[PDB]
Amino acid sequence: AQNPNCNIMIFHPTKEEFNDFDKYIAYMESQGAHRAGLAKIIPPKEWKARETYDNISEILIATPLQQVASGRAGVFTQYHKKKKAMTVGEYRHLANSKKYQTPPHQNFEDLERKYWKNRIYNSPIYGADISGSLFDENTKQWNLGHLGTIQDLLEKECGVVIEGVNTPYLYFGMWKTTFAWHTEDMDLYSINYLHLGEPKTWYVVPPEHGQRLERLARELFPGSSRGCGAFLRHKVALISPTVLKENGIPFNRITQEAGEFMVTFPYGYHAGFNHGFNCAEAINFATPRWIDYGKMASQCSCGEARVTFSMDAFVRILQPERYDLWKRGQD
Ligand SMILES: O=C(O)CNC(=O)C(=O)O
Ligand SMILES: [Mg+2]
Ligand code: NI
Ligand SMILES: [Zn+2]
């Protein structure tokens, strides 16, 4: 069995190996990469996402989200308070202000310490989930707006044609902006490219151990667990590495830098934080190996998780018993 300790693997594809996306994902899995839940891919030196980022300040962040925490430093939830619209140039200036900027630090490890000590006492503002792309149309390799669609994968594997579309999303971050513990919708893969700026630290639980994280989360957030049998789908709960280690939960950590891709694998729980002003692009995708995970994915039916149009068909075809209840949650 490859990668039996479920370590995060880092890949350095050549320009030739960067041509065929599906083939390279399958290669990484042949080496056991998926056992970690997360892999890093460093693009060949010949590749670029676009020529420059000099012209992005006029992108609008229609609904910036202030991420307000509740709880204790290592075990907290966050809610998202909507703020007034601002441009990427305005948000970058905000990120760099004395109130929001990254503090002095020695290295990534000191910064991580400071994040977990102090996160709850601040409310950073995240420009998340903005439909769009920063890849140049002429970038042919690993262009997250030109990937094979999940609808087409489901049709190829299962024969059934379904409605829905699959497009990327932009994320503009600042110091302490946080992504809560989650798997993807329908336990899909994700791919995330850090276009520019400061790093993103990730934490991940191996897919084979995801239920251990779920059981801890039920213990640590007992009201939320009574409210919903899949409350991690709400994407609000944070648990620190120290608390995970105290509770024996297997996990790994890695820091992504500008110019690097991360892939999350089906049912790989992940969480993390941004080091300073940055911009990432991410999209979900599927492979043949996903279908069995999609059939087994949990679902929130309490009403909180509220998701895209395209998830309807995935539930309807892969999970027909659950469909009626899940759709009640959507309506
Ligand atoms: O970058 C972020 O805020 C969150 N990203 C992801 O959870 C992902 O790419 O799957
Ligand atoms: Mg612009
Ligand atoms: Ni994710
Ligand atoms: Zn729910």
Side-chain angles (χ1 to χ4, degrees), residues 1-47 49-50 52-81 83-214 216-244 246-305 307-327 329-330:
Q2 295 264 234
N3 192 24
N5 286 354
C6 300
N7 298 316
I8 300 166
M9 300 179 72
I10 302 162
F11 293 91
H12 288 85
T14 62
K15 63 190 193 302
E16 297 76 20
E17 287 172 336
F18 218 52
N19 288 314
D20 182 340
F21 183 83
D22 288 349
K23 178 182 189 175
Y24 200 78
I25 302 300
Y27 168 74
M28 294 159 56
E29 293 182 356
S30 78
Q31 305 301 295
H34 59 293
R35 295 193 65 179
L38 183 66
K40 178 180 291 193
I41 310 92
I42 293 169
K45 70 188 180 293
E46 300 90 355
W47 177 95
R50 67 175 307 103
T52 79
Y53 290 89
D54 290 334
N55 302 114
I56 69 168
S57 305
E58 315 305 303
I59 292 171
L60 192 68
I61 308 171
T63 313
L65 299 177
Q66 178 169 52
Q67 302 187 292
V68 182
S70 298
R72 62 182 176 103
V75 180
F76 63 90
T77 59
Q78 60 186 11
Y79 82 92
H80 291 166
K81 184 166 174 165
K83 307 301 279 183
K84 294 197 155 153
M86 77 184 72
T87 66
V88 164
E90 291 163 341
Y91 177 85
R92 181 176 63 223
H93 190 259
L94 187 70
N96 294 336
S97 68
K98 289 188 191 178
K99 178 170 181 68
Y100 293 107
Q101 68 185 214
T102 318
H105 60 280
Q106 296 294 340
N107 51 40
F108 292 171
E109 176 167 354
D110 188 31
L111 196 68
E112 180 183 42
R113 181 191 69 67
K114 288 171 184 300
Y115 175 85
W116 293 103
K117 187 180 161 55
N118 299 321
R119 161 69 184 95
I120 64 167
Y121 301 110
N122 297 88
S123 301
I125 296 169
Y126 208 175
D129 291 314
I130 296 162
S131 292
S133 186
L134 290 169
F135 287 88
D136 182 315
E137 76 182 359
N138 295 317
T139 300
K140 301 314 180 191
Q141 301 170 316
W142 289 55
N143 184 320
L144 299 187
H146 297 172
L147 300 178
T149 67
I150 297 162
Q151 297 78 18
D152 284 342
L153 180 285
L154 182 159
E155 178 184 332
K156 295 181 294 192
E157 296 299 295
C158 300
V160 63
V161 183
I162 52 167
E163 72 289 354
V165 297
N166 177 205
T167 58
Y169 296 92
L170 301 179
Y171 299 79
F172 291 95
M174 68 168 64
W175 170 234
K176 284 172 175 172
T177 53
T178 301
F179 52 110
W181 280 105
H182 69 284
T183 65
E184 304 303 306
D185 288 345
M186 217 72 185
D187 297 343
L188 282 158
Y189 295 70
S190 64
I191 181 165
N192 181 302
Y193 182 67
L194 190 54
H195 279 284
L196 64 95
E198 302 313 307
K200 188 186 295 287
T201 293
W202 300 68
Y203 305 90
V204 59
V205 174
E208 72 204 61
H209 304 298
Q211 293 86 359
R212 294 186 186 217
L213 183 69
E214 296 171 348
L216 179 62
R218 292 192 302 271
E219 293 164 355
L220 297 177
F221 304 97
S224 293
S225 176
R226 288 183 289 273
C228 179
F231 77 95
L232 294 175
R233 296 283 167 206
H234 307 167
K235 310 191 308 186
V236 303
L238 277 302
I239 303 164
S240 71
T242 291
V243 175
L244 294 178
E246 283 169 348
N247 292 274
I249 307 304
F251 76 95
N252 281 299
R253 76 194 80 192
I254 193 167
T255 298
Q256 177 193 20
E257 300 188 73
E260 303 179 341
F261 290 92
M262 305 299 298
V263 166
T264 84
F265 295 88
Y267 197 61
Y269 273 103
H270 52 284
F273 62 90
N274 293 306
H275 292 207
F277 171 71
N278 65 16
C279 171
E281 180 170 345
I283 196 176
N284 295 119
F285 71 93
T287 71
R289 198 179 65 76
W290 167 68
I291 293 282
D292 284 349
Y293 289 89
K295 289 178 176 164
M296 291 185 309
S298 66
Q299 303 298 356
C300 169
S301 312
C302 74
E304 284 294 309
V307 308
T308 186
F309 180 109
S310 308
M311 222 192 100
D312 192 280
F314 303 158
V315 184
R316 197 172 68 245
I317 295 312
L318 300 181
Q319 311 183 308
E321 188 262 340
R322 290 189 173 166
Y323 183 69
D324 281 357
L325 186 72
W326 170 84
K327 195 166 40 64
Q330 241 47 352

